[PDB]
A paper describes a structure:
In 1 M NaCl, the tubes remained a 2% minority, while the ∼28 nm cage constituted ∼30% and the smaller ∼24 nm cages dominated at ∼59%. For example, with 1 M NaCl at pH 8.5, 8.0, and 7.5, the proportion of 24 nm spherical cages was 9%, 59%, and 74%, respectively. The 24 and 28 nm spherical cages are composed of 24- and 36-pentamers, respectively, and both have tetrahedral symmetry, resembling those formed by the previously engineered AaLS variants, NC-1 and AaLS-neg. In contrast, cpAaLS(119) assemblies are non-quasi-equivalent, where at least one interface of the pentameric subunits remains uncontacted. While the number of pentamer–pentamer contacts remains 0 or 1 without NaCl at pH 8.5, judged by the 2D-averaged cryo-EM images, the mean contact number per pentamer increases to 3, 3.7, and 4 in the tubular, 28 nm-, and 24 nm spherical cages, respectively. The bonding network observed at the 2-fold symmetry interface of AaLS-wt is approximately preserved for all the interacting pentamers in the cpAaLS(119) assemblies. In marked contrast, the (pseudo) 3-fold symmetrical interaction interface of cpAaLS(119) assemblies lacks cryoEM density corresponding to the N-terminal α-helix(120–131). This finding suggests that the α-helix is unable to form the native-like hydrophobic cluster, likely due to the disconnection of residues 119 and 120 for circular permutation.
As such, we found that a circularly permuted variant of a cage-forming enzyme, Aquifex aeolicus lumazine synthase, cpAaLS, assembles into a variety of hollow spherical and cylindrical structures in response to changes in ionic strength. Cryogenic electron microscopy revealed that these structures are composed entirely of pentameric subunits, and the dramatic cage-to-tube transformation is attributed to the moderately hindered 3-fold symmetry interaction and the imparted torsion angle of the building blocks, where both mechanisms are mediated by an α-helix domain that is untethered from the native position by circular permutation. While the wild-type protein, AaLS-wt, self-assembles into a ∼ 16 nm dodecahedral structure composed of 60 identical monomers,35 the negatively supercharged variants AaLS-neg and AaLS-13 adopt expanded 360- and 720-mer assemblies, respectively, constructed entirely from pentameric capsomers. Moreover, a circularly permuted variant of AaLS, cpAaLS(119), forms not only ∼24 nm and ∼28 nm expanded spherical cages, but also straight ∼24 nm-wide tubes of variable length. We previously designed two circularly permuted variants of AaLS and confirmed that their morphologies depend on the positions of the newly generated N- and C-termini. The native terminal amino acids were connected via an octapeptide linker using genetic fusion and new sequence termini were introduced either between residues 84 and 85 or 119 and 120, yielding cpAaLS(84) or cpAaLS(119), respectively.
Residue numbers in the entry:
A (entry chain E): 12 to 162
B (entry chain A), D (entry chain G), E (entry chain M), F (entry chain L), G (entry chain B), H (entry chain HD), ...: 15 to 162
C (entry chain H): 10 to 162
Amino acid sequence: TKHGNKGWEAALSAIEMANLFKSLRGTGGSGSSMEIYEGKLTAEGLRFGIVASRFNHALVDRLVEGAIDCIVRHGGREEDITLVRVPGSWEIPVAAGELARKEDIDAVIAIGVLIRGATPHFDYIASEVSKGLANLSLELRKPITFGVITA
Amino acid sequence: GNKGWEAALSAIEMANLFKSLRGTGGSGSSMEIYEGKLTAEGLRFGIVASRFNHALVDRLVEGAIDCIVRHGGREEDITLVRVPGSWEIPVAAGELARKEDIDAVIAIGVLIRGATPHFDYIASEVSKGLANLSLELRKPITFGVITA
Amino acid sequence: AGTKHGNKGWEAALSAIEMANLFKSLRGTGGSGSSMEIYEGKLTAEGLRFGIVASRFNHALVDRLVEGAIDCIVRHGGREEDITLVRVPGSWEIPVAAGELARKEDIDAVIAIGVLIRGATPHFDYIASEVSKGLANLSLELRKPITFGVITA
Amino acid sequence: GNKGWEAALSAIEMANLFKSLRGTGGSGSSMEIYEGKLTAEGLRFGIVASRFNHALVDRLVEGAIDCIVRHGGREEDITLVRVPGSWEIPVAAGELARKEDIDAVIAIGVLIRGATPHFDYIASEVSKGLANLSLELRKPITFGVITA
Amino acid sequence: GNKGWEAALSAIEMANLFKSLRGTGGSGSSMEIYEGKLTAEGLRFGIVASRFNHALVDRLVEGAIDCIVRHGGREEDITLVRVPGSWEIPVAAGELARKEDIDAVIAIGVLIRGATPHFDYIASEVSKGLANLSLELRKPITFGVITA
Amino acid sequence: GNKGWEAALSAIEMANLFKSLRGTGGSGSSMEIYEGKLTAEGLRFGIVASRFNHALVDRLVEGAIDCIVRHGGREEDITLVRVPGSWEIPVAAGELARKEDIDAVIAIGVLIRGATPHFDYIASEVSKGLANLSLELRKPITFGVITA
Amino acid sequence: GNKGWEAALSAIEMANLFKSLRGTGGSGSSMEIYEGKLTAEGLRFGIVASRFNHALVDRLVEGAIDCIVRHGGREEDITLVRVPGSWEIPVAAGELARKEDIDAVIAIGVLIRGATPHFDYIASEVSKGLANLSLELRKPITFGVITA
Amino acid sequence: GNKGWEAALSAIEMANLFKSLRGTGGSGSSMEIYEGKLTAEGLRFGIVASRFNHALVDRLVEGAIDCIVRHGGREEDITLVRVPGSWEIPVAAGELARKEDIDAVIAIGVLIRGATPHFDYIASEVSKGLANLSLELRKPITFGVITA
Amino acid sequence: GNKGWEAALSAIEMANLFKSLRGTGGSGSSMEIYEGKLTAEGLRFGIVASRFNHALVDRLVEGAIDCIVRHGGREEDITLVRVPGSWEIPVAAGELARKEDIDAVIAIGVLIRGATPHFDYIASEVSKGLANLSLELRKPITFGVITA
């Protein structure tokens, strides 16, 4: 909305996708016209989960704060947020798969930082984060949002 | 002039082609050819569009509906789903392609070319997800994502 | 169409929602005491009504700002039937038209959008100064929030 | 054209706009857009101009008259008042605006920034005075003051 | 404004000028000067527009309709025709100009010249056809084409 | 794609536009809009194609026939005329256009401009002839001529 | 030669290899070697060919049919399916491969990589889909896709 | 044009020249001139065409057949023989030339000289063989071989 | 991959073509086409290979036999003749092509490119001799000589 940091933006997507899926599962329109499905930016009664890495905790800490501020401003509740910390970026996909299988959580947010300017070997690590997170959403049929910064 | 029109045209042809393959009847002793007509009467479509780049998607969505109506389709048979960004298109498409009333799905969006790893990785995953989903569910899904 | 963070039409609409909700809290029943009371606004737009005043100059820029403003209200819970739009020749006419809207008993906030070309030559530095003065004075006299979406190129 | 043509156009549109707000609202079920036409039939106007640099000022007053006539307004529905200098435009404009038979006012004038310091307090006060009139009386007043 | 706005004004002015020429005479005993006013009540119009993507010509058509309605015209008295491309405008313009209840015609299009042959030849023929039609049917036709 | 496909699409749409434009008009109560559908059921077509550049023109003619048949047309309702070169296209098009059982005409050919000023004069005359015929006979003639 | 001929040769040999590999094994007394003969008597084939680049793909399809017929195959035992573009090849190949009267599938098409990053993503997904289908269904699918 | 058309024109003229040259001579009283007419009514032809460069040679063969039929020949009086490559053209031409119901032979093919010295030797031997056969058998054989 | 395979494939086609030409039977009233199948059953071949370049010829001879066996031929029907150098191929080929049991002859060898008159003259004579011998004896002889 206004803050701009990728934690804020990543949380806006999660709030909208969580609302969209309830609309889809509910029912169709009255009829005699084109059906439209959209999600609104209201976080009243939604459960969220956040997975964040520890490498560069200075930058990650602000991003995790920004995502939490976004949820409360739009009507969320601080008690309906679960946070998990992992040693590094290689472990984000495996950790998020555990949250997604919970029957309560409705959306999942991944935050982290990637170093791709000093070592010509991290490219292997970076590519697997994007693949693993994307495959999980299709398999479990649950929205998972990308909040990964590159340094 | 726009990829929205092109994507909708492929969807019409693929929908008619799958009715011919899943059919039985008399045939001759010669070679057998299966083709798709461009008559949109009686078919039901689904569109999934992202909001990125503000108003450019609205231009693409307008072209898609124009193709369906002018080729014989009815505007009561379209379903529109809107998602926040390009990263969200595959998951929304899967939900829309798992219901028996839909015959084909069209994906529209705009991607960024900021020359950053953040966008380069997102771009690849959009294409791979839509490709796998059409093979898993055996339903045609058309690609209408442009850049800039 | 629409927009998100970056466009000045979206930020202005955000302030209006927060201010419109804040006033309803202030006029509400007082608290029970026993501690300090903190008043702040929620980003919910359900049941609110707005007005927008836009200038026709620089059709390319202004058009996308008006789309951003309308997009913000709808996404956050607004209803399309509860927005009134007014077009005017130029920036000099914005304050007078805004006053007509603010007096309606069924308008909770007002958003002003326009583009200023100050600095190039005279006849515009005078215009720019008075637009800021008029909108500010109207807000205090009428006691309704009035947001300032005017940009400069 | 000239700045006088532009000022008359704004007056015609604002005068029509105010006549719409005072009327009934739209049918509902959608956004209400209020805008002003450019028909000048049935409207009464007023012009206030200064003598200084009569060569330039006369051209501007001709432009305003041309614009109103071309758009379908009679010359019998125009009141013209002339004043010694720029300092007297706002007080002169106040008398016209209080009448119930005038629906818009146009100010024409020319100033000189490169003059003595005494002719600088005047320059800023013209803008302030006309602005406060419009909000006070709730009646459009248009600006047509240029500089040499 | 946009060239859809500019083109529509010339049709309002020229449609009024003709009604004066083929009617009653002037005062007499002196030179007769003719000119058209910018009123549009009672006039009938026709707009012919091409297709180029779905965005850049929609703006020019909306600018044209706004000019007529704000300057006094009725929406009941406008006919809009869409054609595949620039090459098809003159044949479509001919059909409208032959109708007894149309007073002027506005042509809006996009020429993408400067790219490849097959388009440096189309441009030269579009201007000639509209020019000939006006001199052959005695009905003004206004030119509203942009360059991509 | 190929200009054979594009030229047949334009012909199908103009043939439908002229049926509605020559029928009963709208009752009223709104602006009247005329558009052409992309359905080719019950329409007759003629094609004029040159012979030079043996390989190319055969591909263009196949494209045009494929477009008509896949939109609902019948191969029995197509007339094909072959001519030696581009210079001869306009004269043959006149004969087809003057028949009362043809709704539109498609012109295909290859211009070999690039040298030999003998061929620079031929290029300019093919466009002129086709444009005049369409206006004279009041029938749509589509341009499908490319440059090698 | 052309990849149409090469792709049909590979399909004929793999179809023969899978007949001997699924039959009775060797008695023993030596190393067992399995090879495919180049005889196409009694085998069924399917072909999936796109449409873009109208001229090229037609030459490739003729090459594939010529190879089969001249090796002993019958034109009555060939199935042909046409699709709009390269993006649609993998989905159609799945339907043909799941039939119980087809021994191998040949995929033909033209990729237009070279610009417009829209087409750079399509290129990588056609190979992935065809490779996975062959392993999943346990049927040989041959790659006959070239680049323009 | 194409060498297929040129090679068939030469064959038609030489076939007519050999009929008059083998008939009764002129009575006298002037110089005797023998010429060949361009009429192909009652003459038989044979064509030998290679296969390499799949697309090109098919266009050349169509040109040759079109020339004969449009000059009065019958498609029933044409014999066509296909060979793998250019190296094989002379040997097949000998078999056709030795039949007593053929008046001339047309040889078509594509030489792929440009690299691979393997193909530089083949080029020189095709011309030698065709030239010797014509002199040995006393029948006209026309050269229709191009270079890619 | 190697010219030994290519030379053997031409031999099979030419052998089958000469059985069709030297045949009689019923025929239709349409055009007559003679082609060669790629079935090697019942045919008898001859190979002439040189020893130069040590082991490279062994690779070429291996490819030739693989083609004949896999297309249906029997290894008891091949005759292999080995000569010291390329200069000796034509004389050995003539002896092998003069016996009635042989249907086609294949020539394989390697030439040197030392840029010397000794090798430049030898290279030319190998090609000319094999070309003449096929015309004298009316039997197909295939060229499979490579360089380096």
